[PDB]
From a paper:
Aurora A kinase is one of the key regulators of mitotic events, including mitotic entry, centrosome maturation and spindle formation, as well as assisting in neuronal migration. Aurora A has attracted significant attention for the development of targeted agents for cancer because it is overexpressed in a wide range of tumors, including breast, colon, ovary and skin malignancies. This Trp moiety is unique for the Aurora kinase family in the Ser/Thr kinome and its position is suggested to be important for tuning the substrate specificity.
A plethora of X-ray structures and functional assays led to the general notion that dephosphorylated Aurora A and, more universally, Ser/Thr kinases are in an inactive conformation and that phosphorylation or activator binding induces the active structure. Our results are consistent with other crystallographic studies on wild-type, dephosphorylated Aurora A in its apo or nucleotide bound state, where the kinase was also found in the active conformation. The following observations support our hypothesis: (i) two crystal structures for the apo-protein show Trp277 in very different environments, (ii) Danusertib has been proposed to selectively bind to the DFG-out conformation based on a co-crystal structure, and (iii) the same slow step is observed for binding of both Gleevec and Danusertib. The broad line shape for the Trp277 peak hints at severe exchange broadening in the surrounding of the DFG-loop and is consistent with the high B-factors for Trp277 and its neighboring residues observed in all crystal structures described here. The number of crystals for each structure is one for apo-Aurora A and Aurora A + AMPPCP and two crystals for Aurora A + Mb + AT9283.
Residue numbers in the entry: 127 to 284, 292 to 389
The structure:
Amino acid sequence: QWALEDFEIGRPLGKGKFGNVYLAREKQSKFILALKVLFKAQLEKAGVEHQLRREVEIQSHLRHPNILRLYGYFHDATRVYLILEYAPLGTVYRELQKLSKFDEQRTATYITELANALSYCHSKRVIHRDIKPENLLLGSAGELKIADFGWSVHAPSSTLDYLPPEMIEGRMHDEKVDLWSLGVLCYEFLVGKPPFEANTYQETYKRISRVEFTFPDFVTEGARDLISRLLKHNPSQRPMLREVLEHPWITANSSK
């Protein structure tokens, strides 16, 4: 029974394809939160109703510290308003821009929090399929929080920088999608670029399907081992989030 007049809106937190995320405070409780204002125009013209519902669906019943919470939603005659947890330290995307690349301690800790959140999600057959820095938010304690479950789906289903080969090639894909993305992320955190970056979508597609990536010298063998395990063309060869959390390079550098 919410309404746009229940909130004071302020700082824009980010511009999206279908709308914008705004800082907002609930007038009666003074509760600070983010308001994602999606436009039905663009949404309907794209047919992302099940995507939007699945986002509200999944992210509502997903309660986890390393997952951005969705408190509720409402809509008027044009826009759809998602009332989201506010992440005061912004995106991991912005932090990479700021720090260029991450040390093994910060990286291994974000990977740990990711695997936890992803382990909670996979235990419910929920697979994100869009794990990338701009969807990784930071809480007040710097804790990583996965957001944007638009492309989230249950069980198997059917840029490119973070998508595994099965997805970009259209095949059927399961939880192992996020394990691949996790390896792409681990790489981007240490190197500052994702491993299959190219100047064109068509080049990146080739590099992903062939799994053509090389490590800079400053990438330690421990991180290389984890990443090579996650970036296996074959989803079944990719580890599970538990070999990842139990991977010696993680336990050595993670503060969790």
